[PDB]
Design a protein around this ligand. Structure first.
Ligand SMILES: CCN1c2cc([N+](=O)[O-])ccc2N(C)C(=O)c2cccnc21
Lengths: 521, 398
C-alpha cells in the first residue's frame, strides 16, 4: 500500500462485475492459499469482505518455476473483459541509437512495487475472490492486481508522478521507465552516482516502492530487447549462425529473421539468396539444399558477424548525417552517423511501392523512410548524402505528376550513382517512323505485323504491341497507342518491374535514341 | 460560469486517434504553450483512465516568431452532436480579412462530462517517455462545438459594430472571422484594426479579394499549322470535354485523321473542320449550365501538379459537375506549394459555400504527414485522401 492518489477505475458501460464461480481446488492447495492470503491481509494488500459482495474471481495455487513452494494466481480474464479501456499507450520500442552516452547507468528491478500501488476504492469490490473451506473466507484487492488490465497503465502513471519530483531536483540524472525495470543513467562520477541511485532508491521507498539493494543488482552491459547496452556503446546480442548440413524451411526463415535484426547495425547483411530458398516450399519441415550463391551469402554474412561491431549513442551536440547507397536492384543500404563514418544505426530499404519503378523514385522513398525514422528516434531530420546529381533529381522531379520533397541533401560521388536510363521525347520525332499499335501494329511506312498470343490478359496485350513496335523500329520511334495503361506505365519512366514484358520494353527504351509515346482514344 | 451540456452523436464514442511523431522543436513549443495553458486553468493533465486521444501540432504564425498550437479535432468534430447560415454577398466583396478569434473560447468552460473527449498528447522522442496527456477545461480551439456555444456570446459582441457599420460583412467559421467590405484598401485596413480594438474591449492578417476570383475554363491549342499529333491531342481533349459539354463534335477532325499518317505530318483543316473547332471553342468558353451547389452534398477538391510550380484544382460535388476550377502558381517545393494550394482552396470554399472541401492530394501520405505542418498556417484542417493522378487528366488542364 502506498500514499499515492488512487486512479479512478470504472467498468465498461452497462456491465456488471465478474460473477464467476470459483472452481474447486485441492485441500492441500486451499491450505497454501489461506497462508499466502493471510500474509497479504497482514500487509494490507487484501482485506476480507462480507456476504455483501456478490462478485467473485477464480484463484488457484501453482508452484514457482523450478522450486517447491506454492504461488497464488487469480484468473482476472473476465474482470479484464469487463474493465474499461485504459490509455495503454503505444507499443513502440525506443531504439538504442536515440540514447545518449552516460558515464554511469544502473537498472533497478521494480517488479513487486506493483503491489505497492493502491487500487480504486470503489472498484476494489470487483476484485473479489474466495478461498473455500476445506466459515468461508472472502477477499478483495486493496492494491493493483497482478494480471489485471489497468495495472500496467495505472502503475506507469503513478510511477511518473513519484519520479517527477526527484527528476525535477536532479536534472543531471536520467530515469527512464520500461516495464518492471527502471533504467537510470547520468554523467555523474561513480561515487556520486551510487549516492543518487540511493537517493532515488529511497525516494521510492518513501512512497512505498520496494527496490533492490545495489549489492544484488544487475551489472552492465544490459541485454535489452535483442540489444546489448553499454553506457557508452551498444550492439545486437550474440548472433550465432548455425553450421547445419540440412536446412529446414522453418530454419531458413529463422535464419533470415536473425540476419535482418543484425542489418540495423551490421552493414552488408544480405538475405536475398536465402529468401530465394523459400520458393515453392510445401512444408515448414521441408529441407532445401543451399545454392552456391546462398552458401556464399551465408558464409559472407557469417564473417561480418564475427567482429563485434558497436553502434554509437546519440549526441545532441552533433548533427545527424544520413547516407544512402544502392546495394542491388531495389536494395538500398543506409547508415546514419554523427561523427565521420561511426554510425549510431544502419539499415536497408527494399520496399518496392508499385509494380513498376525507377531508382530515383525508389531513392526518394528510401529518403522518406529514413526521415520518418530519424524524427521518431531523434525528433529531427538528418542531412542526407545521396548518390544522385541535383540535375537528375530536378529533372524527374519537375516532370512527375506526384508532388514530392527531399530534405536538405548533398550529392556524393560514390558509384553506383542513381540515374535515368531513358527519357521520352516531349514532342513527336520528325523523320522517325510512326507506329500505330493496338496484337499488331501498322506504320506510316506501310510496315505491319500482327500476331496472336495465347495466355495474355487484355492489358498484357496492349504492352505486347508497344514492345513489338519498339522491337522492329529504328533508333528513333514514334509510337501511338490507345491504352492509357501502357502509356501511363511507360510515361512513368520505369527502369525496373515485376513483369518481364515491361522490363523488356524498358530495355528497348534504354537502347533507343529518341522515343515518343502518343495517346489516342 | 455555466457549462452548456454537449454530447456525442448517438452510440458514438470519443476519438482514439494516433499521434503522428513530431520534431523536437515542435514538441518544445507544445510543451511551452500547453504549460502556460495549464497554469491558466485552460487545460489539465489527465490520468490513464482517459483512453481517448486527438493529435496536436505546432505550426508557425504568419510573420511572427511564435508557434500556434493546432489540435486536429477532425474525428471528434465528426462524432460531436449537431447544433450563421452563409452570407452569399461575402464572395462578391472587394476585400475580406481573416482574424483568429479562437482565443475567445478560452473564457467559456466545456461541459465537464465532455472534457475527457478532448484528450490530446504531446509525444515523446523515441518513445522514451510515457508522454504528456491533457484535456481541455474550456471550449477548445478547432472543436465544432466551440463556435456554436460561443455563438450567443459572439453575436452580442458583434452588433455594436455590425449595426454601427452595416457596410461590413462578418462571417465566423471555426476560429476564424471573415470581415468583408468594399471600402478602398486604405479604409478597409483601418476598419479591421478598429474591430480588433473593439474586440479587445471585451477580452478577445490574411486578406483576400473574392470579387477577383474567376473560374479557369477548359482551353484548346490555338496554332498556326496543325500536325497529325496536334490533331490527335485536340480530338482526345475534345472527346473528354464532350462528356461535360456534349455539344462538342469531333467528326470533321477525326476525318482529318483518316489513314496511318506520319505523326509530324502537317494536316490542313477542311473548312468543316475549322468551323467544328471554332464551335468547340465557343462551347468551352463558359462553364456548363446547370451546375448547382447542393448543401447536402460533400464538396470534393482534386488538384493536379502541372510542374514548375503550377497547380490546377477543381471543386465539384458530382463528377465533372465542377462548381469551380482554378489555377495556382508558387508564392518553395512541391509540398509547400501543395499546402498553400490546399489552404487557398479551403479558404475559398469557406467564403463561397461556407464549408471546407475534401481534398484528393497527388502525394504520398508519409511525405505529406511529415511536411504539411511545416508550411501550414490555417486554424482548420480540411479532410484529405491521397491518390494517383492519371496522366490524361493533367494533359486536359491548362
Ligand atoms: C537510463 C537510460 N537507459 C535506457 C533507456 C531506455 N529508454 O529510454 O527507453 C531504454 C533502455 C536503457 N538502458 C537499459 C540502458 O542501459 C541505457 C544505455 C545508455 C543510455 N541510457 C540507457
Amino acid at each position: 500500500i502506498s500514499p499515492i492518489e488512487t486512479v479512478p477505475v470504472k467498468l465498461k458501460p452497462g456491465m456488471d462485475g465478474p460473477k464467476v464461480k470459483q472452481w474447486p481446488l485441492t485441500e492441500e492447495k486451499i491450505k497454501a492459499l489461506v497462508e499466502i492470503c493471510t500474509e497479504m491481509e497482514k500487509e494490507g494488500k487484501i482485506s476480507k469482505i462480507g456476504p455483501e459482495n456478490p462478485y467473485n474471481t477464480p484463484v488457484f495455487a501453482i508452484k514457482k518455476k523450478n522450486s517447491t513452494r506454492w504461488r497464488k494466481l487469480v484468473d482476472f480474464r473476465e474482470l479484464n473483459k469487463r474493465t474499461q479501456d485504459f490509455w495503454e499507450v503505444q507499443l513502440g520500442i525506443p531504439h538504442p541509437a536515440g540514447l545518449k552516452k552516460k558515464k554511469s547507468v544502473t537498472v533497478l528491478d521494480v517488479g513487486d512495487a506493483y503491489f505497492s500501488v493502491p487500487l480504486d476504492e470503489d472498484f476494489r469490490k470487483y476484485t473479489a475472490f474466495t478461498i473455500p473451506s476445506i466459515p468461508g473466507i472472502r477477499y478483495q484487492y486493496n492494491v493493483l492486481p497482478q494480471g489485471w488490465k489497468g495495472s500496467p497503465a495505472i502503475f506507469q502513471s503513478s510511477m511518473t508522478k513519484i519520479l517527477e519530483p526527484f527528476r525535477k531536483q536532479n536534472p543531471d540524472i536520467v530515469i527512464y521507465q520500461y516495464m518492471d525495470d527502471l533504467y537510470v543513467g547520468s554523467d555523474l562520477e561513480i561515487g556520486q552516482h551510487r549516492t543518487k541511485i540511493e537517493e532515488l532508491r529511497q525516494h521510492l521507498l518513501r512512497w512505498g516502492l520496494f527496490t533492490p539493494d545495489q549489492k544484488h543488482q544487475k551489472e552492465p552491459p544490459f541485454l535489452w530487447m535483442g540489444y546489448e547496452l553499454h553506457p557508452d556503446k551498444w550492439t545486437v546480442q550474440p548472433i550465432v549462425l548455425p553450421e547445419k548440413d540440412s536446412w529446414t524451411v522453418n530454419d531458413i526463415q529463422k535464419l533470415v529473421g536473425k540476419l535482418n535484426w543484425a542489418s540495423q547495425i551490421y552493414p552488408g547483411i544480405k538475405v536475398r539468396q536465402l529468401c530465394k530458398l523459400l520458393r515453392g516450399t510445401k512444408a515448414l519441415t521441408e529441407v532445401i539444399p543451399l545454392t552456391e550463391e546462398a552458401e556464399l551469402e551465408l558464409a559472407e554474412n557469417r564473417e561480418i558477424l564475427k567482429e563485434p561491431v558497436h553502434g554509437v549513442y546519440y549526441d545532441p551536440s552533433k548533427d545527424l548525417i544520413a547516407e544512402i547507397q544502392k546495394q542491388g536492384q531495389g536494395q538500398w543500404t543506409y547508415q546514419i552517423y554523427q561523427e565521420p563514418f561511426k554510425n549510431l544505426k544502419t539499415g536497408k530499404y527494399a520496399r518496392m511501392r508499385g509494380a513498376h519503378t525507377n531508382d530515383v523514385k525508389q531513392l526518394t522513398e528510401a529518403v522518406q523512410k529514413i526521415t520518418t525514422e530519424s524524427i521518431v528516434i531523434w525528433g529531427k531530420t538528418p542531412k542526407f548524402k545521396l548518390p544522385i546529381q541535383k540535375e537528375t533529381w530536378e529533372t524527374w522531379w519537375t516532370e512527375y505528376w506526384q508532388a514530392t520533397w527531399i530534405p536538405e541533401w548533398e550529392f556524393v560521388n560514390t558509384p553506383p550513382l542513381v540515374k535515368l536510363w531513358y527519357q521520352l521525347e516531349k514532342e513527336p520525332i520528325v523523320g522517325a517512323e510512326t507506329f500505330y499499335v493496338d496484337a499488331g501494329y501498322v506504320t506510316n511506312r506501310g510496315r505491319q505485323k500482327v500476331v496472336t498470343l495465347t495466355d495474355t490478359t487484355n492489358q498484357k496485350t496492349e504492352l505486347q504491341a508497344i514492345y513489338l513496335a519498339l522491337q522492329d523500329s529504328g533508333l528513333e520511334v514514334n509510337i501511338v497507342t490507345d491504352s492509357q495503361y501502357a502509356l501511363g506505365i511507360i510515361q512513368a519512366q520505369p527502369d525496373q518491374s515485376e513483369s518481364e514484358l515491361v522490363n523488356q520494353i524498358i530495355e528497348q527504351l534504354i537502347k533507343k535514341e529518341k522515343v515518343y509515346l502518343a495517346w489516342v482514344p | 460560469i455555466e457549462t452548456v451540456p454537449v454530447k456525442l452523436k448517438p452510440g458514438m464514442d470519443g476519438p482514439k486517434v494516433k499521434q503522428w511523431p513530431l520534431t523536437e522543436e515542435k514538441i518544445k513549443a507544445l510543451v511551452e504553450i500547453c504549460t502556460e495553458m495549464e497554469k491558466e486553468g485552460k487545460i489539465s493533465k489527465i490520468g490513464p483512465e482517459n483512453p481517448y486521444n486527438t493529435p496536436v501540432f505546432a505550426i508557425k504564425k504568419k510573420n511572427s516568431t511564435r508557434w500556434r498550437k493546432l489540435v486536429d479535432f477532425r474525428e471528434l468534430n465528426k462524432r460531436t452532436q449537431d447544433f450563421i447560415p452563409h452570407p452569399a454577398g461575402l464572395k462578391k466583396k472587394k476585400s475580406v480579412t481573416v482574424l483568429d478569434v479562437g482565443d475567445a473560447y478560452f473564457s467559456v468552460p466545456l461541459d465537464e462530462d465532455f472534457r475527457k473527449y478532448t484528450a490530446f498528447t504531446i509525444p515523446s522522442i523515441n518513445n522514451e517517455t510515457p508522454g504528456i496527456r491533457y484535456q481541455y477545461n474550456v471550449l477548445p480551439q478547432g472543436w465544432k462545438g466551440s463556435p456554436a456555444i460561443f455563438q450567443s456570446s459572439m453575436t452580442k459582441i458583434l452588433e455594436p459594430f455590425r449595426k454601427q457599420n452595416p457596410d461590413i460583412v462578418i462571417y465566423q467559421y471555426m476560429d476564424d472571422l471573415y470581415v468583408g467590405s468594399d471600402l478602398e484598401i486604405g479604409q478597409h485596413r483601418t476598419k479591421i484594426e478598429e474591430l480588433r480594438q473593439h474586440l479587445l474591449r471585451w477580452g478577445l492578417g490574411y486578406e483576400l479579394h473574392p470579387d477577383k476570383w474567376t473560374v479557369q475554363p477548359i482551353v484548346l491549342p490555338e496554332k498556326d499549322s496543325w500536325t497529325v499529333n496536334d490533331i490527335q491531342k485536340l480530338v482526345g481533349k475534345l472527346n473528354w470535354a464532350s462528356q461535360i459539354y456534349p455539344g462538342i463534335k469531333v467528326r470533321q477532325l477525326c476525318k482529318l485523321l483518316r489513314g496511318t499518317k506520319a505523326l509530324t505530318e502537317v494536316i490542313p483543316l477542311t473548312e468543316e473542320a475549322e468551323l467544328e473547332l471554332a464551335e468547340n471553342r465557343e462551347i468551352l468558353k463558359e462553364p456548363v449550365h446547370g451546375v448547382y451547389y447542393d448543401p447536402s452534398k460533400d464538396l470534393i477538391a482534386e488538384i493536379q501538379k502541372q510542374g514548375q510550380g503550377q497547380w490546377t484544382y477543381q471543386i465539384y460535388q458530382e463528377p465533372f459537375k465542377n462548381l469551380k476550377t482554378g489555377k495556382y502558381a508558387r508564392m518553395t517545393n512541391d509540398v509547400k506549394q501543395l499546402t498553400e494550394a490546399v489552404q487557398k482552396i479551403t479558404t475559398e470554399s469557406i467564403v463561397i459555400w461556407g464549408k471546407t472541401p475534401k481534398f484528393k492530394l497527388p502525394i504520398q501520405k508519409e511525405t505529406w504527414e511529415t511536411w504539411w505542418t511545416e508550411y501550414w498556417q490555417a486554424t482548420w484542417i480540411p479532410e484529405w485522401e491521397f491518390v494517383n493522378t492519371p496522366p490524361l487528366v493533367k494533359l486536359w488542364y491548362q
